[PDB]
């Protein structure tokens, strides 16, 4: 039949448009099934081209199975089942067109789930990358140890201790690429029908993680002390799921009283175990690190997570998972889990601790976020007066702020983005389902620069102030 | 009671000094719990030392929650629960100190888990990285989409466009860090009875995944054209894992054939879905790369997942996953999923692809590949002769070797290890557990100058004793 060729300079090679031409006829029926196509000889004079380009067309349609061969003489067009002819559905539904790249500027964010960009030292980084590098190259082995490589851990072993007074073995630790992977893996490893507690208000996505894998997922209210070890005794749980350094999202800092309940608690019956979510203990502004709660443990119940996402660079995401011995050993059962972190990452990582450089970047961001919160809660005191209310300790890189307006929590959000402000509600870590109605308020990638102006856009927000035309 | 102070500090600081010999005391309960602390001014004068520095040291307990104050002062120790003092666990169990240093010198590998690291163009990766760092720098914090950055998604669209036939949009695309966390969501995306189907043998680590999600999976057998369009319509399954491309590991290519009895089969009822799982089809040494399975399918019930792993660095472990509407749609209505990607990563990934480097580093591995292959297969017919029997297409970075002997695959990799040869079994490979002994040969990470001697090491294993 008729075969028409682009004798372009960047058109797709001839023994390309030979084979693409003829798949097209063999799908539409032109070539019958079974039925003989031209030698290659044949075709090749027809077409005026190379025998090895029609060669080269054919063995790529052998290959696929669009046409089988013979001993003797001829290629045939293989036999393929026709569609279907279902209903065809339509392409790239609109409302799935939500994607509206367009611009992240002039956005003010107030934001938890960031970094400051603009003080990272990214020339060390990229020095400490280089080192690294240089000294375990190629890259020491291929992929990666499932655990993470083991300098590595090792790396992050002696700086826990050192900060956190977290006292463990690299063989315990695993890493990581974000908490929401090592909970899941963590869920496997501890008892299928364990029953987990979450602190309401909490982490939702921990909760959804929780509900999505099958488990039940008690809700325990917060005191002024934090989780109520009395709703614990009551409800009887077997994990717990605590932030005890400072509390998503309410702020607070659990005591010591309260801490040495929970650890009794968890040794008061085997298979019981406690989650310790340290997401910003780094961060305190009136006094130093508080010791975590893993710390104070001396039955090995307690299961420490820690990050590097709001220390680090905004999205490079790595976590690490403190597991005790007999969960250890269920762990190593596998032997079927990947890493999920760069190991050319985890290197720089590593040479980022060891040199230093990592608790010098701390110790500057510490007084920057130290220095924007309040910048903060002045704007928010100087425009809202009286009418905002901040709840939570000075520390980390959030606290939530109450407001006293008619409009719901809704309306406010709905404003805000419309006043291309990037605000989060309280109500969205109610895990089992007021009116404040609350904010969470970060300030991690917030500038220092629309620090009033933000202010002033989440006070139209709040009282739903239109805009003059 | 007695505080010894090193007034020339770090060490530690004066204030840290204190707290932490207060902290020791209240705990060990030589300082009664409601007990009256020494005011600020009056611990000063007695230490010689600052009242800040007291206050400093104060303020951590209050906080900790080891002191607590009254309006009208002082300060009072808390009272304290004492610990359980019950059952106390050993410390670091010598048998889970398996961390020692085991090295993979000199050891010849026919490993099918890996990516050649010396013909990896790093210099060019890090001179990637750097362009993407300057241009991206002020807008990072931005940067974290879901999904992975929409620039991304789009650069890697446009190339499985090019490259797979794929036909989709950057929407669609879900990135990434590997196909096992893509197939956790996976999982929650779809229907959560949804009965799932994989080859018989195939991927182990998909089979366990599946299995640990408490989904129920049906095993389905090959013949000639891949996985079985026969048993599929007999266990009738919701969900379809298949590697039709390349399939692992049998090495067979599923034929236009069978493609399009699978295609029909999955709109033959809704709800249908087909797990498309490319992983190797960039390196075709007799023909062109060949076209996805997602590529023919008119009905949106296709999957298909990508990644970088074994194209790149298996270090670094990029991975894609491209949605249809309806699960998409499914994904959206979730909005707690965060990206497993570095941002710095991802548009490293970008910069890669988009300056050429990327089709560059392809086309050379390719032939690379391409050339280690039929000189091992050229050597496996030295030694063996006609007592080997060599399987699957002449595509990807390992393949199948059947063996006429009578010794058990178990007693082959023993003497193999003791040969210093590192080799699997195919045995590994079946999903529902069941001669001839039959090895998996990955030549990824396999040296040309180890190839002679590999096989040497080999043949040795399956014959001699
Ligand atoms: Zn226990
Ligand atoms: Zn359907």
Same mark, same amino acid.
């Given at each position: 039949i008729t075969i028409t060729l682009d004798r372009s @300079?960047? &058109? !797709? $090679?001839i023994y390309q448009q030979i084979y693409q031409k003829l798949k097209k006829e063999i799908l539409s029926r032109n070539l019958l099934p079974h039925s003989k196509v031209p030698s290659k000889r044949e075709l090749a004079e027809n077409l005026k081209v190379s025998v090895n380009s029609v060669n080269s067309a054919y063995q790529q349609l052998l290959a696929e199975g669009y046409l089988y061969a013979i001993e003797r003489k001829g290629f045939f067009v293989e036999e393929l089942d026709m569609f279907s002819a279902e209903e065809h559905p339509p392409f790239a539904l609109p409302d799935d067109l939500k994607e509206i790249h367009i611009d992240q500027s002039d956005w003010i964010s107030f934001s938890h789930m960031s970094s400051d960009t603009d003080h990272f030292p990214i020339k060390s980084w990229f020095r400490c990358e280089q080192k690294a590098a240089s000294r375990s190259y190629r890259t020491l082995g291929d992929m990666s140890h499932p655990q993470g490589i083991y300098e590595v851990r090792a790396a992050i072993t002696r700086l826990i201790s050192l900060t956190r007074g977290v006292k463990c073995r690299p063989e315990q630790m695993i890493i990581g690429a974000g908490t929401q992977v090592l909970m899941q893996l963590l869920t496997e490893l501890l008892p299928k029908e364990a029953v987990y507690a979450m602190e309401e208000p909490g982490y939702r996505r921990m909760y959804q993680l929780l509900k999505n894998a099958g488990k039940q997922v008690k809700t325990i209210m917060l005191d002024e002390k934090g989780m109520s070890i009395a709703e614990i005794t009551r409800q009887q749980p077997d994990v717990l799921v605590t932030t005890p350094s400072h509390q998503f999202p309410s702020g607070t800092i659990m005591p010591v009283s309260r801490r040495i309940q929970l650890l009794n608690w968890a040794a008061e019956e085997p298979r019981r175990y406690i989650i310790e979510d340290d $997401? !910003?203990? @780094? *961060?305190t502004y009136d006094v130093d690190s508080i010791p975590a709660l893993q710390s104070l443990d001396? *039955?090995?119940?307690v299961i420490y997570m820690g990050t590097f996402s709001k220390s680090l +660079?905004? =999205?490079l995401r790595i976590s690490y998972m403190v597991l005790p011995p007999e969960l250890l050993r269920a762990y190593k059962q596998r032997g079927y889990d990947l890493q999920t972190c760069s190991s050319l990452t985890q290197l720089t990582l590593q040479e980022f601790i060891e040199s230093g450089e990592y608790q010098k970047h701390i110790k500057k961001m510490k007084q920057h976020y130290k220095e924007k919160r309040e910048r903060l809660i002045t704007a928010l005191e100087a425009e809202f007066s009286g009418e905002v209310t901040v709840k939570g &300790?000075? &520390? =980390?890189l959030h606290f939530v702020t109450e407001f006293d307006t008619r409009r719901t929590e809704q309306d406010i959000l709905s404003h805000a983005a419309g006043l291309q402000l990037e605000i989060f509600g309280?109500?969205? *870590?109610? +895990?089992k389902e007021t009116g404040r109605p609350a904010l969470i308020i970060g300030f991690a990638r917030l500038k220092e620069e629309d620090i009033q102006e933000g202010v002033q856009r989440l006070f139209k927000a709040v009282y739903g102030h239109k805009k003059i035309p």
């Open positions: @300079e960047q &058109a !797709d $090679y $997401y !910003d203990s @780094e *961060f001396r *039955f090995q119940n +660079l905004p =999205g &300790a000075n &520390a =980390g309280m109500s969205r *870590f109610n +895990l």
